[PDB]
Design a protein around this ligand. Structure first.
Ligand SMILES: Cc1ccnc(SC(F)(F)c2nc3ccccc3o2)n1
Ligand SMILES: [Ca+2]
Lengths: 557, 410
């Protein structure tokens, strides 16, 4: 059929005329297949013969596609597509199953010949003209245009979806209790009706769709109990991911490890605790694609613990809008966090992991707050509300960091839960200079031509030291100069730097860095009992900084 | 007398196309409020459902008119504004008056409801398309475009401007000293009257607007009380090596801005290589220096002026204890205005309040909103900002993650 629905008006882009691309000569077999296909389409009204007056043509061909030994008609709409207006959206988001609510029954109805069932605008039909060529293009071809949405045309996906939405609206208004999800060609239909009353409601939906020209040639409401969709298995009362045979191999190419990591990342939305950092380490510096990478020991631990998690099937439950969502987060390694979302303890709607990347230098309190933000955004999308959090951080740890830190934050309601390891702050800088602690005026310079450097200090106690440095830079020499002071000082120390950069780094209390010098510095800060770090401007002739500037720069620059 | 008035032709900027900005996800209660607001607007003819042949999109949000009062829809026309406003603000600009900021009192009155009286040019309508999304992507998204001038669009006051002039004329003739400025959906109304007569005059002016499609419109700013005197030098300043060292950092920073700051005499005194906790055996040519520096930090910055051809930018720092500092400049550290915002909880909530207050000041002073450098993670700002937003405009913003000891100087 062809739907009686009103057409969507379509246009070409500003100042563009339609396509006029010459038909190429085809083999005799392909001509004959096309003649037969177009005869059938024309009888159904899909297509209409037209005159040689209509200028405009787009090439057509045929092949054996999805093994089509009956033969399939293909139209190369590249030129028309370049010339056609942009349409809404296209599709820009799919549901997550953990957002659905439990149903008694769901059925899928596949709409037969979906695009060919929807009328095309008509003022636009002329631009879809095509020609079945003569043998050797010796004589004039048989010309047609489309009356319906064509298979490879730019507007077919959105016009189809728009038409389906309009067609479903009166049915949904009469049946406010039935849920319908439209995905390409398919319709998923869920209700809370008994098996027999559901079956009748489906037959009603099929007769309503028939009235609007859409057949569901799937008689008696087809597809079988566990539905496969977008890498999930859906049941009316639970969901999971679809497979995940992890191979049993001694040799793993880069291709196999990439594939494995994708499957593990995918399973991790319902299998709690999945881990891929060590498998991920193996992918450092792409060694090709067919190259075998031996599994490191930490990688071997990881794959073992993953197989163990994938041992027995695990399903998520669906969402009950009467209840709060609870999200729990655990620190699960080094870059790594893992979370679970549930409404009744232990029955996860879903799970996930977060492996933060936000800066070269961070700490656990920052990273946890980031995981919490990611989870917050996720919940809004999936359930349209925020969850209550359970976090492995004491309230006093969190509020001391955030009230003292220079960036704004806020997070939903949350409670402490004791699931080690707990997030803490591994050292704290003093607020005021330390009475009786030695003061180290540190300074670094590099040349920039030679990359020759120096880093040292002068102390209120007259102590002094410079060390040579080699393939370094200004920023590195400031850091090394602070590290040198920490190495040579006792348990309490005041450090006076003229580096904003260093101070900026150290003030944020990192516990982790992508700079090795910085991680060295952090280890020292953790051993200290007290450190006050202060800043002064370079070359102001400030006492102390004056002097170290003079010995770190006699060599340097 | 019950049919349409005539449309002003609107062009998008030369060679540009309409906006195609992603709708953000919304909470369930916000979605429900918008669907109800939009069913009503559509029943009144203000907006119409559109089909897939419109590929444009502008984000929409729900906020409160006050505290859990009623919901209001807020359309984020920032992109359509840019695409209409290399060429508007020039074809149909509203001049900004320099006497506004000199008034004892300025009231802000929302006049946006008036715009819905005027038909939007049929050919521009598609560019105002927006979407009410569904939760979990379960359902495509409700799509509409406007038939009338929309509230957050800079073309609306530009176009309504001839009507506003006529509406306001008898009132401005009767009160020649009242300054009235229109920005976006609001009027800013300044006078030097005592506070009770100021209010009686605003009530009068409300009666005028009422006859023309506004329903009892609306505050109180006191911009003649808006202050300089920021950067502050301590009084127990000259006691420790550390105090004096912090002092010199604050002055070095300040000499980037203000001509004439010194510090020479202060650095002497730091003379040796001393314990940070030591108290000091001078303060004399240093006390004089410190006093003169303090005198210059009271006064405006000698060589910095507003350039109407340039963006304003605002920086804000979290000071702690519910205090926030900010600066507005067009060229980094040539400050045109500095100030403070304080409560005495949240952080994101205080921050969105600071932003709205700074933007309002900026509109009063320059007729422009600033682009903000906000001290917050983007995602966190994006999740939470509409919870506390109550204004009808939205400034540009960027997110800033670094904060030199700029915090300390301020
Ligand atoms: C499978 C299931 C479980 C609970 N409620 C539903 S409602 C629905 F069937 F329409 C529906 N089918 C869908 C398929 C993918 C995405 C959303 C769906 O909603 N569906
Ligand atoms: Ca240095």
């Amino acid at each position: 059929p062809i739907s009686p629905i009103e057409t969507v008006p379509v246009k070409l882009k500003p100042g563009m005329d339609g396509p006029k691309v010459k038909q190429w000569p085809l083999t005799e077999e392909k001509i004959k297949a096309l003649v037969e296909i177009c005869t059938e389409m024309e009888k159904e009204g899909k297509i209409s013969k037209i005159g040689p007056e209509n200028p405009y043509s787009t090439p057509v061909f045929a092949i054996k596609k999805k093994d089509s030994t009956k033969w399939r008609k293909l139209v190369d709409f590249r030129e028309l597509n370049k010339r056609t207006q942009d349409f809404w959206e296209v599709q820009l988001g799919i549901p997550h199953p953990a957002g659905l609510k439990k149903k008694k029954s769901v059925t899928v109805l596949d709409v037969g010949d979906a695009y060919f069932s929807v009328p095309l605008d008509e003022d636009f039909r002329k631009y879809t003209a095509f020609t079945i060529p003569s043998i050797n293009n010796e004589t004039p071809g048989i010309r047609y245009q489309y009356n319906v949405l064509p298979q490879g045309w730019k507007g077919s996906p959105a016009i189809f979806q728009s038409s389906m939405t309009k067609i479903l609206e009166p049915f949904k208004k009469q049946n406010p209790d039935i849920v319908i999800y439209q995905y390409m060609d398919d319709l998923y239909v869920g209700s809370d009706l008994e098996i027999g009353q559901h079956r009748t409601k489906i037959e009603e939906l099929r007769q309503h769709l028939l009235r609007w020209g859409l057949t569901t040639p799937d008689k008696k409401h087809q597809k079988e109990p566990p539905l496969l969709w977008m890498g999930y298995e859906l049941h009316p009362d639970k969901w999971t991911v679809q497979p995940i045979v992890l191979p049993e191999k001694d040799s793993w190419t880069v291709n196999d490890i990439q594939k494995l990591v994708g499957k593990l990342n995918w399973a991790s939305q319902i299998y709690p605790g999945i881990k891929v950092r060590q498998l991920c380490k193996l992918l450092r510096g792409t060694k090709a694609l067919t190259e075998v990478i031996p599994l490191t020991e930490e990688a071997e631990l990881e794959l073992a613990e993953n197989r163990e998690i994938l041992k027995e099937p695990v399903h998520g439950v669906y969402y009950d809008p009467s209840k709060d969502l609870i999200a729990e987060i655990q620190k699960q390694g080094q870059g790594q966090w893992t979370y679970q979302i549930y409404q009744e303890p232990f029955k996860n709607l879903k799970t996930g992991k977060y492996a933060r990347m936000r800066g070269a230098h961070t700490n656990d309190v920052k990273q946890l707050t980031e995981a919490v933000q990611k989870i917050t955004t996720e919940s809004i999308v999936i359930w349209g509300k925020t969850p209550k959090f359970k976090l492995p951080i004491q309230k006093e740890t969190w509020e001391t960091w955030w009230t003292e830190y220079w960036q704004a934050t806020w997070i939903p309601e949350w409670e402490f839960v004791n699931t080690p390891p707990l997030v803490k702050l591994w050292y704290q800088l003093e607020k005021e200079p330390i009475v009786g602690a030695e003061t180290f005026y540190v300074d670094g310079a590099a040349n920039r031509e030679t990359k020759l450097g120096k880093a040292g200090y002068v102390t209120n106690k007259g102590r002094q030291k410079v060390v040579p440095l080699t393939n370094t830079t200004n920023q590195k020499t400031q850091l090394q100069a602070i590290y040198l002071a920490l190495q040579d000082s006792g348990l309490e120390v005041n450090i006076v730097t003229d580096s904003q950069y260093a101070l900026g780094i150290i003030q944020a209390q990192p516990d982790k860095s992508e700079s090795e010098l910085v991680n060295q510095i952090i280890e020292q800060l953790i051993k200290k009992e007290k450190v006050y770090l202060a800043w002064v401007p370079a070359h102001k002739g400030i006492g102390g900084n004056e002097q170290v500037d003079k010995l770190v720069s006699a060599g340097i620059r | 007398p019950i049919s349409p008035i005539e449309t002003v032709p609107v062009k998008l900027k030369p060679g540009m196309d309409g906006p195609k900005v992603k709708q953000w996800p919304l909470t369930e209660e916000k979605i429900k409020a918008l669907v109800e607001i939009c069913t009503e607007m559509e029943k009144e003819g203000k907006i119409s459902k559109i089909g897939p042949e419109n590929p444009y999109n502008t984000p929409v949000f729900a906020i409160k008119k006050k505290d859990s009062t009623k919901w209001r829809k807020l359309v984020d026309f920032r992109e359509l504004n840019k695409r209409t406003q290399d060429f508007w603000e020039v074809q149909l600009g509203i001049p900004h008056p320099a006497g506004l900021k000199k008034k004892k009192s300025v009231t802000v009155l929302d006049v946006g409801d008036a715009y819905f009286s005027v038909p939007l040019d049929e050919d521009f309508r598609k560019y105002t398309a927006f979407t009410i999304p569904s939760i979990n992507n379960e359902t495509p998204g409700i799509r509409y475009q406007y038939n009338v001038l929309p509230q957050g669009w800079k073309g609306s006051p530009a176009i309504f401007q001839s009507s506003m002039t006529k509406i306001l004329e008898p009132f401005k003739k009767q009160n020649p000293d009242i300054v009235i400025y229109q920005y976006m959906d609001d009027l800013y109304v300044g006078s030097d009257l005592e506070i009770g007569q100021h209010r009686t005059k605003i009530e009068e002016l409300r009666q005028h607007l009422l006859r023309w499609g506004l329903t009892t419109p609306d505050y109180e700013l006191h911009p003649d009380k808006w202050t300089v005197q920021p950067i502050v030098l301590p009084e127990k300043d000259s006691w420790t090596v550390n105090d004096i060292q912090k002092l010199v950092g604050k002055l070095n920073w300040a000499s980037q801005i203000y001509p004439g700051i010194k510090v020479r005499q202060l650095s002497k005194l730091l003379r040796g290589t001393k314990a940070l906790t030591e108290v000091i055996p001078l303060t004399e040519e240093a006390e004089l220096e410190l006093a003169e520096n303090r005198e210059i930090l009271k006064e405006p910055v000698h060589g910095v002026y507003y350039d109407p051809s340039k963006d304003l930018i605002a920086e804000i720092q979290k000071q702690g204890q519910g205090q926030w500092t900010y600066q507005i400049y067009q060229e980094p550290f040539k400050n045109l205005k500095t100030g403070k915002y304080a409560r005495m909880t949240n952080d994101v909530k205080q921050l969105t309040e600071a932003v709205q207050k700074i933007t309002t000041e900026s509109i009063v002073i320059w007729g422009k909103t600033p682009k903000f450098k906000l001290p917050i993670q983007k995602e966190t700002w994006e999740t939470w900002w509409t919870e506390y937003w109550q204004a009808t405009w939205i400034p540009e913003w960027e997110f800033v993650n670094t904060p030199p000891l700029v915090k300390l100087w301020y």
